[PDB]
Amino acid sequence: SGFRKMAFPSGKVEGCMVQVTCGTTTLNGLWLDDVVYCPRHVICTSEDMLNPNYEDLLIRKSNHNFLVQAGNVQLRVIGHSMQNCVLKLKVDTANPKTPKYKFVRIQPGQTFSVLACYNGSPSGVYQCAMRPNFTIKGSFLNGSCGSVGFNIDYDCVSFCYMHHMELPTGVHAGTDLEGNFYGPFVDRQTAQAAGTDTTITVNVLAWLYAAVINGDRWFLNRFTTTLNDFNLVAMKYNYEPLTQDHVDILGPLSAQTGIAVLDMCASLKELLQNGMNGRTILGSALLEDEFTPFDVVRQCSGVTF
Amino acid sequence: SGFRKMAFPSGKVEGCMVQVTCGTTTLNGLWLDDVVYCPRHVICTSEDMLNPNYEDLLIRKSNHNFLVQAGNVQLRVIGHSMQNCVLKLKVDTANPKTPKYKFVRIQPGQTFSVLACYNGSPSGVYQCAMRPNFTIKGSFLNGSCGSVGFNIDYDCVSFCYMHHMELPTGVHAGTDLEGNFYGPFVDRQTAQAAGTDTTITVNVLAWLYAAVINGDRWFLNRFTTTLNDFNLVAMKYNYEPLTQDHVDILGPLSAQTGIAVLDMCASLKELLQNGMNGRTILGSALLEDEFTPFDVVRQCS
Ligand SMILES: Cc1ccncc1NC(=O)[C@@H]1CCOc2ccc(Cl)cc21
Ligand SMILES: Cc1ccncc1NC(=O)[C@@H]1CCOc2ccc(Cl)cc21
Numbered sequence: 001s002g003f004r005k006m007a008f009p010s011g012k013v014e015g016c017m018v019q020v021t022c023g024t025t026t027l028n029g030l031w032l033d034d035v036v037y038c039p040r041h042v043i044c045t046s047e048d049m050l051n052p053n054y055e056d057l058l059i060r061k062s063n064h065n066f067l068v069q070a071g072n073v074q075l076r077v078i079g080h081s082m083q084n085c086v087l088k089l090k091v092d093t094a095n096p097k098t099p100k101y102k103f104v105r106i107q108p109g110q111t112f113s114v115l116a117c118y119n120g121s122p123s124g125v126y127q128c129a130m131r132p133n134f135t136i137k138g139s140f141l142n143g144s145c146g147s148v149g150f151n152i153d154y155d156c157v158s159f160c161y162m163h164h165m166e167l168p169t170g171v172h173a174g175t176d177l178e179g180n181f182y183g184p185f186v187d188r189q190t191a192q193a194a195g196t197d198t199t200i201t202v203n204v205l206a207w208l209y210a211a212v213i214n215g216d217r218w219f220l221n222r223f224t225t226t227l228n229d230f231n232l233v234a235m236k237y238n239y240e241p242l243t244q245d246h247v248d249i250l251g252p253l254s255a256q257t258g259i260a261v262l263d264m265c266a267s268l269k270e271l272l273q274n275g276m277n278g279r280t281i282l283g284s285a286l287l288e289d290e291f292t293p294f295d296v297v298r299q300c301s302g303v304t305f
Numbered sequence: 306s307g308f309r310k311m312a313f314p315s316g317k318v319e320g321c322m323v324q325v326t327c328g329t330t331t332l333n334g335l336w337l338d339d340v341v342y343c344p345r346h347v348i349c350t351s352e353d354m355l356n357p358n359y360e361d362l363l364i365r366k367s368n369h370n371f372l373v374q375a376g377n378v379q380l381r382v383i384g385h386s387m388q389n390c391v392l393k394l395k396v397d398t399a400n401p402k403t404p405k406y407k408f409v410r411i412q413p414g415q416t417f418s419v420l421a422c423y424n425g426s427p428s429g430v431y432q433c434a435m436r437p438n439f440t441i442k443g444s445f446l447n448g449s450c451g452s453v454g455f456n457i458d459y460d461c462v463s464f465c466y467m468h469h470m471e472l473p474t475g476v477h478a479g480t481d482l483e484g485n486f487y488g489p490f491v492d493r494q495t496a497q498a499a500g501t502d503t504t505i506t507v508n509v510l511a512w513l514y515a516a517v518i519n520g521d522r523w524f525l526n527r528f529t530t531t532l533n534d535f536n537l538v539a540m541k542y543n544y545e546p547l548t549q550d551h552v553d554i555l556g557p558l559s560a561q562t563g564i565a566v567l568d569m570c571a572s573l574k575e576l577l578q579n580g581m582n583g584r585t586i587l588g589s590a591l592l593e594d595e596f597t598p599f600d601v602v603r604q605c606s
């Protein structure tokens with residue numbers, strides 16, 4: 001029993017975190033094989049970040065300008081290239097701790113673990129979701145740039161996020177490991193705002209199933225709804241549309257609990273129109289949307305890595 | 306900016322998780338140097354769960370009865386001893402991944418990270434606090450026994466918890482790494498109940514300071530209170546008494562935000578009386594009590 005926000009074990013990613021210093025800027029890098037990946041804004045100053053021409057700034061850099069440190073060992077950069085908003089620093093040494101890995105771009109609603117680092121040293125790990133507005137509600141201080149988001153399937157790390165910046169609302173923006181930003185963001189000190197956020201409907205339903213598995217059933221009701229009627233109500237409450245794919249993904253949980261997806265949807269509909277009435281679900285007075293259906297299955301059936 | 310429930314990176318603990326099998330029971334063990342630590346109930350059978358005599362059951366065991374597996378490598382147990390409710394299986398190989406570590410016994414209100422494991426394999430990492438009733442509100446299934454709770458200071462792991470049992474309410478009971486149980490619990494299937502839980506007041510105040518540091522101030526008020534008047538109100542909402550030690554511990558956050566501890570206490574009193582009125586603090590509609598003052602300072606600075 002019990003349901004908690006649970007991150008993937010961070011050990012495989014901890015063995016990849018290095019410190020990257022370029023002039024006065026120090027941030028984190030991800031050392032995989034003989035390449036260190038880090039945000040390209042490490043080459044920028046106060047003047048540069050206002051309107052940076054990254055190709056021009058990088059052409060002025062030499063390999064010895066990049067100080068890369070893996071623990072107390074200096075790595076020697078033997079090459080440098082840029083792929084979108086990420087800088088790839090070729091090093092002479094392949095990381096002996098390189099795990100089996102892939103670079104994956106995730107969809108909004110998908111969750112991942114973040115290994116927050118400062119000076120190439122992991123300080124914390126947390127589970128968060130890629131918001132529908134493509135921001136993440138992380139916890140990052142200055143120096144956390146280059147910290148990565150990931151998932152683990154079997155013995156393989158899927159790197160899905162690299163932290164680049166913090167928006168005025170305190171939410172965070174970053175890229176996949178190919179340097180493509182999630183959201184309509186750019187890596188420049190300029191006016192940028194996170195769009196209005198929406199609730200991740202499929203994840204709320206998955207968390208309601210987790211609550212039923214844990215014995216919380218007060219919210220269940222005799223009613224069911226059509227997918228269309230539910231989506232009408234969802235649009236009204238700034239909730240993401242629930243697609244047929246989401247219903248099929250929720251299938252195993254629906255079978256395990258004996259509560260059809262459209263039956264759980266009618267519970268969610270009542271929770272939105274009426275509220276919790278002083279009651280909580282899984283110790284929360286709000287509807288949690290940062291547990292996907294796979295996260296619920298994984299935690300409720302104990303899958304290991 | 307941002308505030309999240311943050312667990313320590315689990316890598317240093319992952320390299321210590323092994324599987325311990327004794328007969329039909331399989332749980333997790335913590336391999337540090339040449340010793341594997343695990344709950345002593347791994348030596349119990351169906352008939353030996355209500356009233357186990359562990360000294361007698363362990364005397365009947367030999368080193369070869371304990372099967373220890375570190376990855377796909379069987380470790381050879383060369384000795385066994387019991388320290389309170391933990392079993393210490395001396396092995397013929399020092400763990401090369403042994404980090405700098407200490408065994409620490411924590412107080413209620415203290416937080417730690419839990420590396421949940423099944424069959425000596427880490428499945429997830431989460432954060433939680435030692436409740437005032439000495440239980441933990443973990444996420445644990447059958448086979449999770451031996452999973453550990455820890456904190457990390459610089460490069461050193463302070464092991465503070467080893468999971469042992471689930472109480473009827475779904476809350477969890479375990480011991481420090483010296484086998485001493487937290488709470489009035491025993492490693493027996495005898496009827497055991499977690500006492501009524503209370504909210505960790507000092508942690509709620511630390512989290513209100515975290516909210517102020519992050520720009521959330523709607524809950525602040527022009528009032529202050531005496532420590533006694535705050536405690537008379539708090540107790541009515543099943544909140545832990547706030548001691549002078551807690552007031553001293555909240556000093557740095559009080560200085561950083563410019564809001565005196567007794568001033569924040571009056572804001573807490575108002576929140577308890579009014580509820581949140583559809584508002585949230587740090588994305589939560591409830592008062593969070595699983596962030597210590599030390600956690601807030603650490604995460605915010
Ligand atoms: C200070 C901080 C906190 C958390 N995460 C990240 C940061 N850092 C930033 O955001 C920096 C400094 C500010 O200006 C910008 C603008 C664009 C980009 Cl890509 C980076 C940055
Ligand atoms: C099944 C499970 C789930 C989560 N965490 C733990 C468990 N396991 C238990 O509680 C087991 C089996 C049941 O009874 C007792 C009694 C005493 C002790 Cl020390 C252990 C246990």
Ligand SMILES: [Cl-]
Nearest residue numbers: 249252293297
């Ligand atoms: Cl599924």
